[PDB]
Every structure is written in C-alpha cells, then in structure tokens.
Amino acid sequence: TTALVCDNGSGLVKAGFAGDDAPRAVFPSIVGRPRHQGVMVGMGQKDSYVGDEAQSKRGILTLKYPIEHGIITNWDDMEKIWHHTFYNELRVAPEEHPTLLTEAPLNPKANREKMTQIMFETFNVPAMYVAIQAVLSLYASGRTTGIVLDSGDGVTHNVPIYEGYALPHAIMRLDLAGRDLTDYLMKILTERGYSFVTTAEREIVRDIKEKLCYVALDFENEMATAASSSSLEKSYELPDGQVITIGNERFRCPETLFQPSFIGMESAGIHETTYNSIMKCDIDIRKDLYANNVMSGGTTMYPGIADRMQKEITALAPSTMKIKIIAPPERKYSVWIGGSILASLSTFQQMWITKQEYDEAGPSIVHRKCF
Amino acid sequence: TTALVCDNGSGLVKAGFAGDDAPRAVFPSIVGRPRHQGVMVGMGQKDSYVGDEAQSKRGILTLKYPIEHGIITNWDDMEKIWHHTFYNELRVAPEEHPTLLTEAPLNPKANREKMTQIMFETFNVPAMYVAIQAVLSLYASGRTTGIVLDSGDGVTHNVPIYEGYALPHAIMRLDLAGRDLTDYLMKILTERGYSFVTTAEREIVRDIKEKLCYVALDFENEMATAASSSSLEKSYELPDGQVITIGNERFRCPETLFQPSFIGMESAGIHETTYNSIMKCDIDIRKDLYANNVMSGGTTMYPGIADRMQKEITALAPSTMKIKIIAPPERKYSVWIGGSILASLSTFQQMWITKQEYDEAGPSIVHRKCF
Amino acid sequence: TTALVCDNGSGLVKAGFAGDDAPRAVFPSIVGRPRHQGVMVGMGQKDSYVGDEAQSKRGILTLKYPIEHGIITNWDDMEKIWHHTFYNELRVAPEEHPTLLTEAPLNPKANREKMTQIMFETFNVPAMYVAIQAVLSLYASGRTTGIVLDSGDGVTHNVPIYEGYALPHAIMRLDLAGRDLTDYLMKILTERGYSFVTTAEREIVRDIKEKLCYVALDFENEMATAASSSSLEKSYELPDGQVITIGNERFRCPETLFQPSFIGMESAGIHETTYNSIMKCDIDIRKDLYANNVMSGGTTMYPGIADRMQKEITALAPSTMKIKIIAPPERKYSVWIGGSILASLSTFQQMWITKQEYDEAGPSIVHRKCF
Amino acid sequence: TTALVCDNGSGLVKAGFAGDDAPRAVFPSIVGRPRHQGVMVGMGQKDSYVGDEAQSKRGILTLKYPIEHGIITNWDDMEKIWHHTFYNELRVAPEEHPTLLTEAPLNPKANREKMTQIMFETFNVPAMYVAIQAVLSLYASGRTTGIVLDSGDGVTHNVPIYEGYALPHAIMRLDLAGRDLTDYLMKILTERGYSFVTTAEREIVRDIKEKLCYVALDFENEMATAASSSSLEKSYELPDGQVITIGNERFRCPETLFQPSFIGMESAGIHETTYNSIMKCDIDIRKDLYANNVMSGGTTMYPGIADRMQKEITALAPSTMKIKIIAPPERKYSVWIGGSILASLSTFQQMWITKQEYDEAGPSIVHRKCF
Amino acid sequence: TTALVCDNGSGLVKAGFAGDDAPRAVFPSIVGRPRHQGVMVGMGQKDSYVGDEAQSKRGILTLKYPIEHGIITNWDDMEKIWHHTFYNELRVAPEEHPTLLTEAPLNPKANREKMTQIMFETFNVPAMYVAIQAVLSLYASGRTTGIVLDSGDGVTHNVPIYEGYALPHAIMRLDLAGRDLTDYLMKILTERGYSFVTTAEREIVRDIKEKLCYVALDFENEMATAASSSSLEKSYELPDGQVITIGNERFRCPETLFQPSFIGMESAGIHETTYNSIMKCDIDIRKDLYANNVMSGGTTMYPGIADRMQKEITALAPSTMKIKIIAPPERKYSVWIGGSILASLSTFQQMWITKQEYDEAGPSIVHRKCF
Ligand SMILES: Nc1ncnc2c1ncn2[C@@H]1O[C@H](COP(=O)(O)OP(=O)(O)O)[C@@H](O)[C@H]1O
Ligand SMILES: Nc1ncnc2c1ncn2[C@@H]1O[C@H](COP(=O)(O)OP(=O)(O)O)[C@@H](O)[C@H]1O
Ligand SMILES: Nc1ncnc2c1ncn2[C@@H]1O[C@H](COP(=O)(O)OP(=O)(O)O)[C@@H](O)[C@H]1O
Ligand SMILES: Nc1ncnc2c1ncn2[C@@H]1O[C@H](COP(=O)(O)OP(=O)(O)O)[C@@H](O)[C@H]1O
Ligand SMILES: Nc1ncnc2c1ncn2[C@@H]1O[C@H](COP(=O)(O)OP(=O)(O)O)[C@@H](O)[C@H]1O
Ligand SMILES: [Mg+2]
Ligand SMILES: [Mg+2]
Ligand SMILES: [Mg+2]
Ligand SMILES: [Mg+2]
Ligand SMILES: [Mg+2]
C-alpha cells in the first residue's frame, strides 16, 4: 500500500503520499477562534477554524500557532490540525497507511513520545516513524555526504554527514527562524508609521516579508546605498487599499540571520554556526563537508542568501578549500521530498514501528527505533 | 544658564526649568476655535484659544488635540501650543535656554525629526535633546534597575533596565491609555440615560472619570457587590445644575486596562504585558526586575491600581520571586522630574545636540545622538 | 622575602603566598564585556569585568575564557586577569616577590616563553619559575613515588615518578576535562526541555554539574535503576525561580571521563590511560606505581570517582598487585599547595630564573632552566 | 607452476609472484571499523575495511595494526588481511600456488606455528616455507657474505653471514623501528602547537615523517644550525587546508635510531649494535663483514642514513679496516626480491613443507624444516 | 692482628676476616647510575649506587659489571667497590689489616700489578698477597691432592695438584661461566614470548636461572621427556605480577657447560677439559687425580651437575680407575674459606708482601712473590 508523509513544521503543514514529487496539501499551521459576539441566528458558525479557512476569516478570529520552535505547545490544537490533514485535505482513512513524521534534532523526548502516542491511540495507523529533517534533506539532494543547513519557521539546525554516518557531537541548533524575522519586521515597520499588532496583521507582515525581503551581499554598503538613493524602496498594498512603502527594512530583516544581536541574542550567525559544526568533525572529512553545503527550508528562500553564505564561509575557511553552497529551487519542500524517498525505499520497510512493538514496549520504543 | 524641560504629552503639557522639583506650567494640550457666528462688534475676539483659555469658553468652541497616541498629527496646532508654553506660560525667550523634550518609544522617526526641525528653525534654541520617558521615570525614582510601566493619555509602554543598560528587544508598547478610557466611559454612560457627544462634553466626562473612577481588586466580586447593594453609587453635578449618578461604571472603565477586549482590542492587559517584557530579558536579571516595578503617568493614578497589578503579577510570576510595585505619590510628574534631574547633571552637558551639529548633519542628527 | 604562587588554570585562578596552606584568592578565570546599549548617564560603567564581578553582572555581559585546554589563547585578557590577581585580590606590588607559575605538560613552548616575557616585561618580578602541576601535586601528597592523575578544567594528564626521577616517555595527556563535561551536560539537558545557550547559562549549567553530578560505580546498573525507579531524580532552582529536575543526567555527564566516545572522541578513558602510562615504565618500578595513584584537580571531586577508578584499574592490573587510589579531601588545591611547598624550600632558591639570566639569554631561558 | 611470495611486515604488505622484480600488491597492513552511527539506509556499508580502502575513509574509522614488533597480536585481522591479499589484490586461488612467508629472527615459535596452521587449514596451499628476512635481503644483494641491517616498521635486526653459513650467536634484535619514530614525531610536534591524537592523525604524522625527515650527519651541529638560521624549516599542508611548519623535528625524529634514549630505551644505537654483532664473530671473518654492511627496509630510506652509519662504524672499527655500507635504491623491497629469487631457484624446490609432511608431523614441522 | 680476605669475583664480592668460617659481606659486584631526569628537589640523590643498593633501585639505573672474565675492565668502578667493601660493609680501616686477594690463573699480569698498586697507594694496607683460587679451594677441601674445577661468574679453570706441587703445564682455562649462561637463557626465553633486554631484566633472568635451572643426566632423553609430557614445566612470577612458564629451558641453559657449541664456541666441555688436564700429568699421579675431583664456585651449584660430571669422566677414563667428584654443600664459598685458612696459618706470615718490599721493588714484586 501507500504510506503517508507528513512534515509538521512550525508554520506550514506539508502532507502527501510516498512516491510523489510534491506535497498534496500545504496550508498554514494555525487554529482560529472568534473574538466578537455573533448576532445572526442560523449561520451555522463553527467554534474553530483550521488552515486556510482561518486565514480567510482572519479579521474576526484570534490565530494561534500550536508549534513554537519545533516544539508542540498545544496538543488539542495539534490534534485538530492532524485531523484536518487526514480528513479534509488528504481525504484518507489513517488506519491502513503508515505515516512518516519529522522532527528537529535536540528536541525534548516527550515531544516524540506524545507524537507516537497520539498517532497510535487517537488514530490507528499501522506503523509510524520519526526522521530527522536534515537527513531527509540530504536524501532529497541525492547525496550521502555533506552538512545540511535547514531553516524553517521555528528552528535552524546543522547536521554533518560523511558516508551515511552522522556525527551527532557536531550538530548545532538555533532558535532563530522565520517567525523571529516576522516579529522583527513588525517591530521595525513602526519607524515609518505603520502599526501592525493583531495576529491577522502578523499574517499581513509575514506576507510583506516573504514578498519584499532579500539578503544583502554587503550590509554596510547596502545601508549606505539605501540612505543615499531611493531605488531600493518598494510599495505594498494593504487589504483595505492603503499603500505602504518599505526602504532598508527589506534587507534589515533577513540580516538578523547573520547578526542575531539585532533581536537581542548572543548566538552566532548561520555562517559561523556552519563553520563551527564543520570544525567539530574529523580533519579527514572536512574537505568533503566544505564542498557539500546543503540548504533547505522556507527561510533559505531569500534572494542572495546563498551568495552571502558562500562569501562568509569562504572568508572563514582556508583559501585552499573549495566552498559550494547547494540551494536547489525546490528546497522549500526538500524535507518532504526526502521523506517520500525514504518511505518509498524497499529496504526501509523493516524499520517501521509496528503496532505490536508499540503495544509491548510503550511510547518509549521511538527512542530506540528512531535516531 | 538654566535649561527648559518640556513634557509634551497627549493630554497635558508639563513645562518648567531644570533643577526644580515641580513643573512651572501644566495645562491641557488643546486648541479651540469658535463654531458659532458672532454678533457683537468690538469684542476683540480671537480666532483660536490654547490651553486653559480654551477650557474656559468651551461651550462655544470646537476642541482639537494636536497629539494622538504620542504622535503629533497637527503641526500648526503643535506650534501654537509650543508658542503658548514658551511665551504666555513660562514667559521666557527660547534663544538662550536649551530645551529637553520627551517621546514615547517605537514612535515614527519623522516625529522627532520634525520636532528637532521646529525647535531649531521656528525657535532658536541653542541645543535640544529627546529622551525616552521611561528612562526619565527611572531617573526620578532614584534607581538604575527596574521595568517602568508608563501610562499617560495616548500610549502605554514598558522599558526594562538592569544596570543602566536598556534591553530594547523587551520594550513593549500599547495604544490604550486615558483617552480610550474616557471614550469608553462616554459610551457606557448612555446606559443610564446620560448623553455626552460634544468635545466639551468629552471634557466633562474626563473630569467625571478622573474624579470618580477606581480599579477593583476583584472585578467579578465588585460587579456582584454593585448589583446587590447600592453603596458603590456616587453622584456628580453637571455645570448646568443637573445631577447624574454612576454605579458600576466607576470601576468598569479602568478595567479596560486589564481586559482590553472591552473596547474591541485583541491585545493583552498591562500585567501580562509587563510579565512578557520581563520574560524577554536574561534569566540572571529577572529577579531584580520582578522587585522594581515602577509606575508613572496620570493613568496610573486610579485607586487600587497598584494592588491589582501586584496581585496579577504575583499570580503570573513564580512563588519564590518577590514582586514589588513602586508607585510614588508624585508619579503623575515623574517623567518631568527625571527630565529635570537629567538636564541638571554636570556630565550630561556634553550630549546636547548643538546648533552647529544640526546645521552640518540635517535633522537626522537626532537618531544618532539620541537613543 | 615572601614569594607568590599562582596556579593559572583553565577555569579557576588560585593565587597566594608561599608558606601558606590555602590560596588567598580563588575566583573564576573569565573576562566579561557588555552586550547591550547603556541609557543611564553618569553610572561610571566599566568596559570590562574580571572575576567574581563578571559573574555578578553576567546577565548583561558576554563572558570569555582566556585559556582553553591549558593554552592561553587571549593574551590581553590574560594580562587583565594577572593584573586583577596582583592588585585587586592579593593587593601586592609584583616587583619584590618572585612568582611561581604552573603549566600542563606537553604544552606549546611559546606558551611558557610568552608567560616569562609578560612576567619580566609587563610586570617586574625579580624572578620566576614554571613547574609541572603533577610534580607539585606529588609534593603536596608528601611522597616522591607515584603516578599523578591531574584533571582540572581544560586538560587531564598522567605523570609517573619513582624516586624523584620522572619518566617523560610515559607521560600521557588528554584534552577532556570539566569544560567538556559542562558542554555535554548542556547538550543532554535539552532532552527534558531545558535550553541553556548563553555564556551566563553556561555558568548556570556548570553550577548544576558541580552541585548535582556523581560517578556511578556500575554505569549500566545505574541506568537500569534510574529507568525503573525515580529515587535518583533531584531538583534545582534557577535564578528566576524556575525549578528543573535532573534524572540520569546526574551520572551520564561524569561518565564521559571513562567513555570519551560520548562526546565523539576516539581516546581512551582515564583508567586505561593510567594503566597504559604505568605499563610504559620499567618492570621493577610498576609495583610502587600501582600502589601510589594520586588524584588532583576539581574534576576529581565527583562522588564515587575514586572507587570507580580503583575498580577499573584492579580489573586491568594483575590480581597479585595492590591498587591504591590516593584522593585527599583537599586535592582541589593540591597543585597550589605543592607549589607553595616547593617555593618555601631552602634548597630551591638557587633554581629561580633571575632577571639577569633572562636579560642575557632571552625568553628561551625557561626551557633549559625548567623541566 | 608459479609460487607466491608474501612479505607480511608490521606496516606494509608486499605480495606478488616468484620470478618478478617488484611486488604486485603493496598496501598498508591495517583494518578499520566504523566508530560513528549510520543514518542513511541502503548504503550497503561494510563492517570492516582492509588496506587502502581503510585509508580512504579513515575520518570515520578506527584503525588497528594486526602486527606489532613483527609479532601477530590479532589473528582474525591477520586472516582478514591474508584473504584480502589472496583475493582482492592478487586475484588468485591459494590452492595451487605454494606460498613463501617471512619472519623476523628471535620471534616466538607459536607465531610461525600458527602461521603454518592458518596457511594449511584456513587456506589450502600445497606447500609453504618461512624464511629469515635478512637472508632474503642478502639474496637480493647478490652476495653470500655480509651483515644485514634490516629495519622495517616493527623490528630492527642484524644477521651476519660469511660463506652461506650463519652465526646465530651474533644475531642481534631491536624493537625500535618506524612506528616508534612516528610516535616520537607525534609527541614532539606538540611543542609547536600541533595536536595529532587519532589513528587517522597517526597516518597523517607518518606521511609527514616519511616526506620531511632525514638523518643528520652531525646531530649537535645540525641542532645549532637549526637554532641559528631558518633554512631547515619546511611546510606541510594538512588535508583540511591548514599548513604546519616543522623545524628541527625533521632530523630529531630519525636521531632516535642512533640515540634510543630519546624514547626512554636503555639499548644501543644501530651502529653500536652492528659493531657488537661483528665483534661476536670469528676474527678471520671480521674483515669481510666490515666491508659488506647491507641495509634494507623502509626505515633505512631516510636521507643521509648511510653516510652517518659509515661514519659511526668507521669511528668504532680500527683504522686499517675498510667500511662499506651497501644501500641499494630498491632496499625498501629487498626482502621480497630475495624471497622471489629464493622461490625461483631450481634447487630450492626440495625444501618446501608439503601438505603430507604437515599432516603427519603437526604444526611443529616448521621448526625442523625452516631455520 | 686480624687479616682481611677478599674474593673479588666477576659477579659476587666475598669479604670477611681470616679465621672465620663464612664471609661477612656478600653482595653483587655492580655499580649503578641514573638514566632518567630528576624532578624532585632536595631528595639528596647520589650519582652512583654500589651493591645491594643498586639492586634495590634497579628500575631507574644502568648497571655495569667492573669485572668481565676475571679481568678488571673498569678501575674507577673497582675502586668504588673496594671502598664500599672496606667501609660500608666490613666497617674497618684498611691500614692495620693485611688483605688477601684472589685471581684466576692465566690472567694478564697488569691485572695483579694494578691490584697491588691500588692496594698500596689508594689504600694503605700493611701487606697484601694474591693467591690462585683453585689452591684456596683445595685448602678448603682439607686435602693436598687433586684437580680442582672452579666455575664462578666469568671463568672456569682446572688446576691439578699432587703433593702440594702444582703442574702449571696442565692448567686449563675456559671463558664460559654463569654470565654466559644468563645471556643464553635470555636469548632462549624469547621463544616463548618473554623479552628481557635491560640490565635490570638481566638481573631478573639471573634470578630465574639460579632458582629454576638444573643439569640433566641425559640431555636427549630429557628433551624427549620435556617434549612428550609437561611435568618439567615450572612457573615464575615477575616483579610486576606477570607469571612466566619455563619448560626445557630449565636444563637447556646449564647444558652449555658440556656443549659449549650452543653459544658458538669451539671449545670442549668441562668434563673433557678435566680429562685433558688429567692426561697432561705424569702417569704415576693420574690415579690419585681421578679420585680427587673437587668442584667449587656458584656455577657448580646446579642440581645434578656432579652426577653428570662423574658419568662423563667415567665414560672417558679407563674402567679400572675410580672416579670421585667432591662437591661440598658449601663450595659456593670454598675459595674464601681456603683463603681464610691460608691467611690464618702461622707459617704463612713470612710470605706477605710488606710495604717496604713494594716500595723498593715497584709493582712487579707480586710476580716473584706470588705464584
Ligand atoms: N520566498 C520566501 N522568502 C522569505 N521567507 C519565506 C519565503 N517563503 C517562506 N518563507 C518563510 O519561511 C517560513 C516557512 O518555512 P517552512 O520550511 O515551511 O518551515 P517549517 O518547516 O517549520 O514549516 C514562513 O514563516 C515564511 O515566513
Ligand atoms: N486621578 C486620576 N485618576 C484617573 N485618571 C487620571 C487622574 N489624573 C489624570 N488622569 C488621566 O491621565 C491623563 C493624563 O496623563 P498624563 O501623564 O498627563 O499623560 P501624558 O503624559 O500623555 O500627558 C488624562 O487623560 C486623565 O484622564
Ligand atoms: N565538586 C565538584 N564536582 C564536580 N566538578 C567540579 C567540582 N568542583 C569543581 N569542579 C569542576 O572542576 C573545574 C575546576 O577545576 P580546577 O582544578 O580549578 O581546574 P584548573 O586547574 O584548570 O583551574 C570546574 O570547571 C568545575 O566544573
Ligand atoms: N622514504 C622514507 N623515509 C622514512 N621512512 C620511511 C620511508 N618510507 C617508508 N618509511 C617507513 O618505513 C616503514 C615501512 O617499512 P617496511 O620495510 O614496509 O616495514 P615492514 O617490513 O615491517 O613492512 C613505514 O612505517 C614508514 O614509516
Ligand atoms: N644455585 C645456583 N644455581 C645455578 N647458578 C648459580 C647458583 N648460585 C649462583 N649461581 C651463579 O653463579 C654465579 C656466582 O658465582 P661466584 O662463585 O660468585 O662467581 P665469582 O667467583 O666469579 O664471584 C652467579 O652468576 C650465578 O648466576
Ligand atoms: Mg521543517
Ligand atoms: Mg507622558
Ligand atoms: Mg590546574
Ligand atoms: Mg619487513
Ligand atoms: Mg671466584
């Protein structure tokens, strides 16, 4: 039979079937609830809205994200979202399709324990498996060597792999991703007089960010150019017809990835994190790691991010080494693509967590069965 | 020489001289214009009235506030008010006294740019400086550690400071202040048959609010007590001799600070905003922030507001931490007091924005010179 | 006159006077610098903090260790720390007191060359000397026979001595010490949901480790016991009032000493290193080495480390030999104690590196004068 | 038919066919096993790697040498290496080719007994023979008189032969060879800040040693020259792009052959060992031994070793005697060359240990059949 | 007064006083010097160790024998040993006690000349005398007829005496003694995997030899028995706790006395040497020589040596003659016993070499005064 692949990200939900080349269902990972009082009678109004329906009537709802920083904080909302994916989007019965789930490294173990418990108790999937997203990204890339820089909506992590062997002591994690960039853009848009406060306005700011932001090759020169001329200014139209203009905020927002101190964080940029992860590996494998930098996730879709990353890593690495940044045009769904590839493998079918094993071993089977 | 300190708030204007302990001039920040047709000849009537004069003949004028939400919307009226303060109230020549101005955080930059331009072009002040009101409140408090909750007439903001170092990523702003409370009281007074519509009636309602309103320690119990008995009812006399009676509207109006949903806002209460600002700071400085909650502004003068804030924050913070709310009896003028203290410092005299620097660097000198 | 003894470790600084039985000054070897922007004026804030002062205001500073793995990487910070020790802690003038310094074996020679250059040029000490820390530990033990296992914050080394004669071909070194254990504990605390990232949080994790960790006599049995029951779980209170609970991480962290593969190292455990060092010595001196195992350093202060070491070495050594582990209660300062003992010897005064010898022979005099 | 010649050294394996002038297969004598955890599925990864394959993926493996000091310590690994040589390198069937093996003198007898047992039981060679490596070196030299100084990777031995007659009472052995030199170079490279610890780093250090080391004609003068000038310094590039610089360590490493006390050994140098072996022979044969010093093995390939040996022996021997050191350019494979020559002799075919003799006489036939 | 008797052997020193029945001081004839570098200060370490003190700290010293083959090769070490005997062992003043010394026959004359010169110049003995050790052995035996077979540590000699008359043309000498046996045992212990190389390991091997070796009555039958069964195998415990097992090496080592070709010597066995010495005497004295074979020295203390000697000589001598081997249980000190007996004789006091005779006749007086 066919197996389901679900990539439960912080912001988006990517669901589909193993063997396909693109997710069947992609929609925001939000749940909305009304915040006003209803006066019409017989409208058949619901008490909650999930996905694109919540984004539709977002002017009267309060939107909540069940996942923050790759960690599920609301489990009732997560069950609602999983039910939505399984019934109203994929339109399948989760009793005959094994389901493949993803998770960021260095997460709490209770997260995956509860994921397995919900999958086997609330739903009746015959088997399930939890895979590291960077491994799936490297599967999608078609290679078995390289360090993967995955940046989605909640977390950013690096995982180096040499010959199918992972070096877990060199895995580095960062709680700086797209949502922090959206909040920073919201904060810095107030300098021009634009005030976005509500969650619906947060969605507006997210759309502005993902439609008008880019990474500058040289930050100081770009700031000087923006200050001098006005060619970098762009206009955006609000839903009510108002037009706002954005100048240096276009590239000041993605700059937080390379200078996390813009949002009060002491951590290092993504380039320095990648270099530190590489330098924690064996000296004989560093050359192949320098030439196989793989990027994945929505936050890696900014224009000019790959060139900036290559420039920074070249400035860090020695001159003799060759630095290659591998950013496929479909890296926004590379985790799901690799998950589908892994679930479609003939030799992978012996590593599913079957129902009998879960019943005999409790929810702790996931730790020993899954890396 | 002596330097001027001007606290241009949304509702009130606090002006005076550095080194004093109280503002010299305090008057409403309104400009009035006649709305009827004159029949007497030779009365020497003016076309505009500023300050207490407008409040005197408010039965024949239309009153306008030049500032909404800490942002100056009318600049001709603001110039009129500044001229009033400099000539008819302080009775000084603004050419030999440096002037210290205040501004709320996260305001548009054009606001302070135009403030500097007006101060250096319309008037001829030798130097000027713009300071954050929360920093001045902490100066007045006599301490260099703590989170300040300033609530005036247009805005409410929180600014945490540990050892003279501000954490700008933890600053939170709220466009809910005294004017919204006055509008809400006007709206809810119609339930008893009292209809106030005009701007002069808005001043009447503001006086009723600031003379008869208080914050309830427990809102539901207070509502039950008001419904059961009649001891909470108070009487107010209108200018024409009519007497109105107010019941649960006395504490239903200030409750909007802790439940902003009463006026259709999705934001969180002041207690939750303070807790969120504290939790955005470093873990090693949170203990000193919990014990140094400083309140300032006119909107913090409601009876029982400090006890309610302490109760809510204690309910939010862990049991081991000690919560102290610092509400001095003179917190209505603490911003001006701190501004005077800062302007009277010997080591502060090197940070004035002199006329030559403004001339060479344009109106953009304020951003680099002032935090 | 009196001579100074300074034990410049990776984590701690132990300074004092020769002839005493305890260091006069002990404080962390860190330098902190502000990472936020200051708003108060006239606070007299400094640009750097050294020692306990940095640990005080660690919520607003970035902390750096000038020494990694017993090698000084930052020399300006090291000069700052030495100035701190000489002036603000010992309160003496380093021009009439000869200073005794310590260093780990198999260090770069430029390290001690620059140490001598700084001591004779930046300061004006009349004489100085560099001693191996294991020799000082054996001096403190009061015996002249035995192999010393010194483990501080950056390095772990073994040095066997028979009759005052060292066997340098049997000296073994290991770059696994307390800082690696702190990093491993930080990494494995994320499994329970606790995220410590900043340097101040690194200090928090170090305190948790040194107040709640121990060495298990049998690792697998301890893991089984921790999995079955909950008697091994302990609670710790964070500075902000939050309480965290630690289970098997209490003994999983010190286990890295005996199984260095937990942090991706191919090296052997401390017991195997000690056995290999003993087996590299002459057959006629091995019996006295088996019965004189001396431990020193802070990393040797874990509960149950001595019993585990004895058990492992007994399992390695032949049955007839007698294994004794000598772990005095004051082994945390045994290097300093032995240095004081050596500096107080009457027959040692002829081996100081005087100023004239340094002037005539350059900084290379340390190699020929010191072992 | 053709007979196989296998020179199982400590570091290298030299295999081929009798009658040829060069070994067919030369590769390191190592077996590698993974030390990390695999995450890719379907890679077809092996559990062990032998030879150059282990040297390829050495950044993720732990490398072990089955032979130390000419003595086989691991027999499963030795069987793996023999299978590799017989199948993946020579690509022959070891059932119709008699195999000639080599062994150092004064080895344990169980070593050759087990070699014969493995050759006749695990494989089915029709016949086999064990020859002394010095005799094969003298065969390759084309002469039947002289003392042979063979130094490979584990052992160094001297064997004097006059007219085809060996003097076994004058054979001298030394457990100081290339591996000790590699370990010493690793130890003394830490003085410049370079730290090599892992087995792969041991291979790196071995490459540095065999590409940058030489024997100084006069050690003290060379040390003075290296200290004074900098013309003796050379640079080496690490696999990750880092560049290291080596000074007097180039000739300080090979000096251990003439001064074994550098690594804590009480033995005498190779020159003194050769002189002592010569002086243990009859007085009438010493003159021909002085003029037929033959060197063999990889450790004899250092530049300037032959001149130094001649100088030392001339200083030891009387003035009238003539000292000649015979170091052919192909002495790295002279043992294999002599073994091929011996196996290709028509008169040697009667001294093979046939299968019937082994079956009737047990594994002890090797002692009586082979010298 | 009392006279001193000193038996300066190759391995042992036997000193005492004339008239006693056992030597007062017996200790090894070695001098040790440190070979490592000292790190402790104030240990009062010496630069040389003599006797049992050298055997104590032999794991850090290099041991040298001043005497090889009964010939003194190092004279500074010999002076050190003589000073040790005279002061730290006998505790007497060598100025009032005449000293009796011993020497092997057919030694260089310069040996005894320098012995006399040292005794009369470095020390101030009133008189001295050099006696042949075989004559002293025959004195100890209490008879004046017979051939003496003395075998110590360096030499083996035969001296036949008939009626107090020596036949110097029949004296035979052999440079095969205990030290050669120790070296042979060291060489043949490598066949079982035991490697002893250092001088301290030479002492270990000497102890093993003198505690586990014996002479086989029939060598070939003993070899067959050892090969067949395992009852001849014995175990020995090394100082570090390791246990070694010795089989046919127990009797293969003493066999070198009867088959000197085992160590590459062309000479004849001790039995054949004794027979040849007897056959060089007059035919009328051979019968009394056949029946008075006297053995002395440590090398004659092997079990079964006397029976083997009797069997061999009986096989050589004609059937009618009666062969008696006289091996007293105290033959290890028979030379010293006979020297004491000779020095205690009243009629011997006229043959001392007085100081005046030495002064007038130079060091050559010993040749004419002593046989
Ligand atoms: N073209 C784009 N440019 C910049 N940011 C983008 C773009 N597309 C998506 N993003 C950001 O990436 C995030 C989605 O990343 P995704 O890979 O779905 O994360 P997750 O794996 O956690 O679901 C969104 O928050 C969005 O703001
Ligand atoms: N005693 C009081 N009780 C309740 N509200 C008050 C009281 N005094 C003043 N206010 C309110 O506070 C506002 C003035 O606050 P102020 O600090 O002057 O604001 P700003 O700093 O913007 O001028 C007025 O709108 C008034 O309604
Ligand atoms: N009681 C304890 N238990 C476990 N670890 C400890 C204890 N006390 C100190 N340590 C660790 O030992 C280190 C200090 O060791 P120290 O001997 O000062 O090293 P150094 O000689 O390099 O200064 C610290 O990093 C600390 O984490
Ligand atoms: N050109 C060279 N210079 C110095 N050392 C070398 C050189 N070539 C090889 N070696 C050393 O010699 C050793 C190989 O010697 P080899 O004769 O193969 O020993 P074996 O007979 O035990 O296999 C290696 O360990 C290597 O370090
Ligand atoms: N019981 C014994 N069995 C075998 N050999 C012995 C025994 N006792 C001593 N020896 C050997 O005899 C030697 C000592 O002989 P000794 O008579 O002291 O010689 P010397 O007269 O030259 O000092 C030692 O080298 C020792 O190895
Ligand atoms: Mg994702
Ligand atoms: Mg204000
Ligand atoms: Mg230390
Ligand atoms: Mg070889
Ligand atoms: Mg003797």
Residue numbers in the entry:
A (entry chain E), B (entry chain C), C (entry chain B), D (entry chain D), E (entry chain A): 5 to 375
Which statements did the authors publish about this structure?
The motor protein myosin-15 is necessary for the development and maintenance of mechanosensory stereocilia, and mutations in myosin-15 cause hereditary deafness. Unconventional myosin-15 (encoded by the Myo15a gene in mouse and MYO15A in humans) is a plus-end directed molecular motor essential for stereocilia development and maintenance. Here, we present cryo–electron microscopy structures of myosin-15 bound to F-actin, providing a framework for interpreting the impacts of deafness mutations on motor activity and actin nucleation. We propose myosin-15 enhances polymerization by bridging actin protomers, regulating nucleation efficiency by modulating actin’s structural plasticity in a myosin nucleotide state–dependent manner.
However, none of these three classes displays discernable density for the In conformation, even at low (0.015 RMS) thresholds, indicating that the D-loop in these classes predominantly adopts the Out conformation. Class 3, corresponding to 19.5% of the particles, instead showed discontinuous density for the main chain spanning G48 and Q49 at a high threshold (0.018 RMS). The data we present here reveal the closed D-loop conformation in ADP F-actin to be a mixture of In and Out states whose occupancy can be manipulated by myosin-15 engagement.
